[PDB]
Design a protein around this nucleic acid. Structure first.
Ligand SMILES: [Zn+2]
Lengths: 214, 135, 133, 149, 100, 116, 54
RNA sequence: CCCCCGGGCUACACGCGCGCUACAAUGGGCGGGACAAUGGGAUCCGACCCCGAAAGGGGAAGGGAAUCCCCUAAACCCGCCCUCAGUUCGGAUCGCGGGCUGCAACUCGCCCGCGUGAAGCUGGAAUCCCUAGUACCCGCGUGUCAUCAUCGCGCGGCGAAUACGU
């Protein structure tokens, strides 16, 4: 029962989806600015371009990246939340419209509850959910170790976005809760730094394990 | 005006649900036949069950007793062309099982392929049983 | 006067006709303000919102599109409309703004489908049945 | 002011609401218990689906006419669930379409061409155009961008 | 009254041969001719398996027979018919004539 | 008592084939409409000559695609199964069934022990 | 008396199509009036004018 | 040796490979609104009209195919019912009836309607395919064909994430 003023929407200014602005959005993390693109656009849709060039993903809008991360099926070959999540025909794969709608409704709910800019909230969530330290196997002399290595911002972004989307999928699996409400809850919790956020929990866990085996 | 448990012929149906779906608790009535019967009777198939009058229940029972006389084409009934009478009919909970049983029993009696397969408990129609149909 | 222009996408071909008028835009006889879904409506209307009312309120565009799915049709119409507006205005500021926003408005897309190959020909060129003995 | 200037769903709604005065258009005997094609499983839930179907056929004859009854079957067909077998496409039934078109002709809204389907008359053209005019007069307040059309 | 001539062949050189012959035939005299008009090329494709047995990975040969098609209209004058019908057609080309 | 669609055997015996097909379940009806072959015609001749007088010998046939009619009720027909001629005493409840439904071609399997 | 050695005039089935060259029965390409087997066609195709052209 | 007539390769306590359908809301149903490409077509494709609830039946234009036909594809959008439940999830299995091809449908064929409503609540050890219009998802053509596609070979629709290494 969507009203017509929202079914047939026509933007006037150049904003994200015609509703939300960016010129007031700030980024404090000095390591993530050059990779969080906030250029004014209406349609956050790039038709596969920028993927062949190594560093081309920095020219993609952050909202489009969130949409593409959300356009998933779940955890297929690994376990998340304690279960496999294989839908395989009930999945929104190769369907960007449904992801568009999910993100739209999520941003609406965020605006309603917080009464702030949902893009600002997403930026805060990313910054608070991005990890700084990881592990890896390094060999010297002929034996195997487990060392502590730093992380690049272009990878921190991927980690954060993936974790947010996975938390949403978990919270939506087999429950009266919807994918949009789950995404909104996850983003708000990650922005407010609450332990009930999958992304923040994973960040803390990774950093702890690295500080341990460093 | 709400009956949490309504007593239609032989069966007790739920009230919180719509009539077209409550009537499916009976054996022999699907959603389609139920919609047919409710439309012939003049009852809203989306109404909550339990908001049913004795008059309504009686009309439903009569239609079930013989639907073809109240409309209900001869091609929308479970047993068109009865073996020993013709007389297109629609059987419900009690007589449906007897009809199945007597069909299978006459097959077994005349000793036909389908009856032998029924006895042995094996697929009857056309299937291959090497790789599947394993208990 | 009148101008005609074309645009192409994967298996979709659009042709647009522009002249002077009030600001009516029609794709396959129907207005653009009620095109569905939203994600194609915006695709088609981005160039007009870029140019502005002070240019679109003096022209009438009609587009005829054929082939290749609704998103592809929308993109082809977008390309054709941008090219027609640029050729009608003969202004360089608009062309520069378009090239900055997205160079594929005026330039086209050169991507087609790869032929399929014989292991699982139905699925694709690089896809094949598994081996899990 | 024409059909092409408003959405199809709202128009079909407003035309089904209006086709009820016309007495030549009424559901047949086998309508209350029947499916719309093999590709379906359950009957229509609405008790006034006949008028919606008739209005849709009317608008389709307007748009694409001349058109006979085998392409409307394709338009009204769809995708069937075949159990454990994969899904396929199947066309719909023709009796609904024949009855609808005959009722419309009796009312004087369409006529048949000798060899190419059926077309609308001026009497029917006026019907659609006036209903669309009313609907657009109602809409162009919610979306003022429709006034210039 | 006009005459239409359809040419089909696997070899393009023979097609060009006959078409330029009739083009000179029609230019020597002053007569209106349209074309030659190229029609879509038609391909007979046949995919089949190589091995005469069932063992080994499967491999496929894809054979194709191509047919090119040209159309011509000649305006059907007496002199044109006379000096057209007298052209030896190379056996690798089929030609069919008829008046509208 | 026996009644096929509300008809007794005395009544069935005096109806025409065009009337009995109306009762059969559409596959035997299609068969009878399309017609009978010379093999089935010869078998019918045998049956009719046997039910009264001349033929006093066993009736053997390879015809398994023949439908049981009312004028055959009361006889015994030997049907080929691939190896031998199985006897079949035709009763009333058989009406409308193929003759091969009562002569199996395989044996009930009694399994053993899986090997190596 | 001499007719128990002749086949029947089949109109449909795999026994209604022999190969003009070898005599096989089952696999017949049968496209555009080709009554040849998949084994002989692959050997006589160039003589008929087919090429690869891929 | 080779030609007919009937059976079998379709038999089933079990072990395995490659797949289809599912375990639901990133959905099921009802009614409306859209949008392709490759290929094929003589007793072959068949528009158009009339019968029938459906499967289907009776006439019949045009087409030897840039002219006519197969052919208004599905996923997708809108509104209404359902709201976390062996369920309006899921379809196995079985009864009655109606049909088409074929000389012949029991063994042993495909389709339609009304009923019936089995396991299945995301899956151990282990293992597989994929770097761009590619993979996942969606449906059409053709080969085999009298009738029969969960197959092979191809066609398009929507459309990513990561690495530019060892
Ligand atoms: Zn050969």
């Amino acid at each position: 029962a969507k009203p017509l003023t929202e079914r047939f929407f026509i933007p006037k200014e150049v904003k994200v989806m015609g509703r939300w602005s960016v010129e007031d959005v700030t980024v404090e993390d000095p390591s993530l600015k050059p990779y969080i693109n906030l250029d004014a656009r209406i349609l956050p849709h790039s038709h596969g371009r920028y993927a062949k060039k190594p560093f081309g993903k920095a020219n993609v809008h952050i909202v489009e990246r969130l949409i593409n991360k959300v356009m998933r099926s779940g955890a297929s070959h690994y376990k998340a939340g304690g279960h496999f999540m294989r839908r395989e025909h009930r999945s929104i794969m190769s369907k960007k419209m449904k992801a568009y709608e999910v993100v739209k409704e999520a941003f609406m709910i965020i605006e309603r509850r917080t009464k702030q800019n949902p893009i600002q909230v997403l930026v805060k969530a990313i910054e608070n959910s991005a990890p700084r330290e990881d592990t890896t196997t390094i060999a010297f002399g002929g034996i195997r170790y487990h060392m502590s290595v730093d992380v690049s911002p272009l990878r921190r972004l991927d980690i954060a976005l993936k974790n947010i989307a996975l938390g949403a999928s978990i919270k939506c699996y087999r429950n009266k809760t919807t994918y949009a409400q789950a995404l909104a809850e996850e983003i708000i919790a990650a922005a407010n730094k609450d332990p009930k956020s999958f992304a923040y929990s994973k960040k803390e866990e990774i950093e702890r394990i690295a500080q341990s085996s460093r | 005006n709400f009956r949490h448990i309504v007593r239609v012929a032989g069966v007790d149906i739920d009230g919180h649900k719509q009539v077209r779906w409550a009537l499916t608790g009976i054996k022999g009535i699907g959603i389609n036949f139920a919609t047919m019967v409710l439309r012939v009777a003049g009852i809203d198939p989306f109404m909550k069950a339990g908001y049913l009058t004795d008059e309504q229940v009686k009309k439903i029972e009569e239609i079930l007793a013989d639907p073809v006389a109240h409309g209900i084409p001869a091609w929308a009934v479970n047993r068109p062309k009865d073996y020993e009478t013709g007389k297109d009919m629609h059987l419900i909970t009690a007589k449906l099982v007897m009809a199945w049983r007597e069909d299978v029993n006459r097959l077994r009696r005349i000793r036909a392929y389908r009856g032998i397969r029924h006895e042995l408990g094996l697929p009857v129609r056309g299937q291959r049983t090497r790789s599947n149909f394993r208990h | 006067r009148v101008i005609q222009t074309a645009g192409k996408r994967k298996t979709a071909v659009a042709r647009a006709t522009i002249r002077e008028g009030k600001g009516r835009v029609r794709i396959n006889h129907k207005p653009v303000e009620i095109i569905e879904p939203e994600i194609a409506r915006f695709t088609i209307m981005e160039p007009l919102i870029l140019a502005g009312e002070e240019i679109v309120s003096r022209v009438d565009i009609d587009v005829k599109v054929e082939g290749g799915g609704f998103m592809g049709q929308a993109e082809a119409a977008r390309v054709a409309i941008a090219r027609a507006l640029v050729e009608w205005t003969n202004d360089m500021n608009l062309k520069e703004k378009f090239m900055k926003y997205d160079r594929t408005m005026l330039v086209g897309d050169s991507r087609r489908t790869e032929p399929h190959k014989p292991n699982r020909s139905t699925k694709g060129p690089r896809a094949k049945r598994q081996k899990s003995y | 002011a024409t059909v092409y200037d408003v959405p199809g769903d709202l128009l079909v709604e407003r035309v089904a609401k209006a086709l009820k005065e016309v007495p030549e258009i009424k559901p047949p005997e086998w309508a209350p218990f029947v499916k719309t094609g093999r590709h379906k499983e359950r009957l229509p839930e609405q008790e006034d689906w006949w008028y919606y179907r008739v209005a849709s056929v009317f608008r389709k004859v307007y748009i694409d006419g001349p058109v006979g009854i085998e392409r409307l079957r394709t338009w009204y067909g769809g995708r069937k669930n075949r159990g454990h077998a994969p899904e396929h496409f199947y066309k719909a039934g023709g009796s609904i379409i024949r009855k609808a078109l005959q009722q419309l002709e009796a009312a004087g809204f369409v006529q048949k061409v000798p060899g190419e389907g059926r077309i609308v008359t001026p009497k029917g053209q006026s019907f659609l155009d006036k209903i669309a005019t009313e609907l657009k007069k109602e809409l162009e307040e919610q979306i003022p961008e429709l006034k210039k059309y | 009254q006009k005459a239409r001539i359809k040419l089909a062949s696997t070899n393009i050189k023979a097609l060009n041969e006959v078409t330029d012959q009739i083009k000179q035939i029609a230019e020597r005299t002053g007569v209106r001719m349209s074309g030659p008009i190229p029609l879509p090329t038609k391909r007979i494709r046949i995919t089949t398996r190589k091995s005469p047995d069932g063992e080994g990975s499967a491999t496929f040969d894809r054979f194709e027979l191509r047919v090119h098609k040209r159309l011509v209209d000649i305006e059907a004058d007496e002199r044109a018919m006379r000096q057209i019908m007298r052209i030896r057609v190379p056996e690798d080309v089929t030609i069919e004539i008829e008046l509208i | 008592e026996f009644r096929y669609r509300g008809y007794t055997l005395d009544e069935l015996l005096n109806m025409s084939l065009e009337e009995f097909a109306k009762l059969l379940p559409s596959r035997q009806r299609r068969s009878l409409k399309r017609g009978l072959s010379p093999e089935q015609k010869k078998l019918l001749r045998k049956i009719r000559l046997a039910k009264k007088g001349k033929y006093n010998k066993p009736i053997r046939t390879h015809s398994r695609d023949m439908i049981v009619l009312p004028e055959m009720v009361g006889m015994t027909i030997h049907v080929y199964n691939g190896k031998e001629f199985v006897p079949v005493e035709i009763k009333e409840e058989m009406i409308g069934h193929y003759l091969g439904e009562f002569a199996m071609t395989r044996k009930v399997v009694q399994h053993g022990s899986p090997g190596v | 008396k001499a007719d128990y050695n002749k086949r029947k005039p089949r109109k449909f089935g795999k026994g209604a199509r022999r190969c003009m060259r070898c005599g096989q029965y089952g696999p017949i390409i049968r496209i555009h009036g080709l009554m040849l087997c998949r084994h002989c066609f692959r050997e006589v195709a160039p003589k008929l004018g087919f090429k690869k052209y891929e």
